[model samples]
Target: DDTPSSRCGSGGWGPCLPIVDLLCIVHVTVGCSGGFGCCRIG
Candidate 1:
């Protein structure tokens, strides 16, 4: 899988396993709450 084995701190310098880890986070948090009509509870 492209997922990282571990997580990094908020102010960390770099990724723990490479671009995949960062990319994974990017895709997830890109717009988790951009809607106005819905609360997006999930």
Candidate 2:
């Protein structure tokens, strides 16, 4: 319900989480908390 922008969240936001679950789990787990970033394809 948005546009393609600089979106950053978590790996747990979906599935197939990898290294994020480790390092990321620290700073927002750093995106392990939001393991990666993507476009708001919605």
Best-fitting candidate, scored by TM-score: 2
Q: What Cα-based lDDT does every candidate model obtain?
A: 0.27, 0.32
**Cα miss at 13, model 1 (Å)?**
12
In model 1, where do residues sit more than 4 Å from their true spots? 1-15, 20-42
| Candidate 1 global CA lDDT score | 0.27
TM-score of each candidate? 0.15, 0.16
lDDT of 2 at 4: 29
Worst 10 residues of 1 by lDDT: 31-40
Candidate 1 residue-wise lDDT, 1-42, digit = tens: 343332232232232233332333322222122321111122
- List model 2 lDDT by residue over 1-42, tens digit each: 333222245332332235433333232222223445332222
Model 2: residues with Cα > 4 Å off, grouped in runs: 1-35
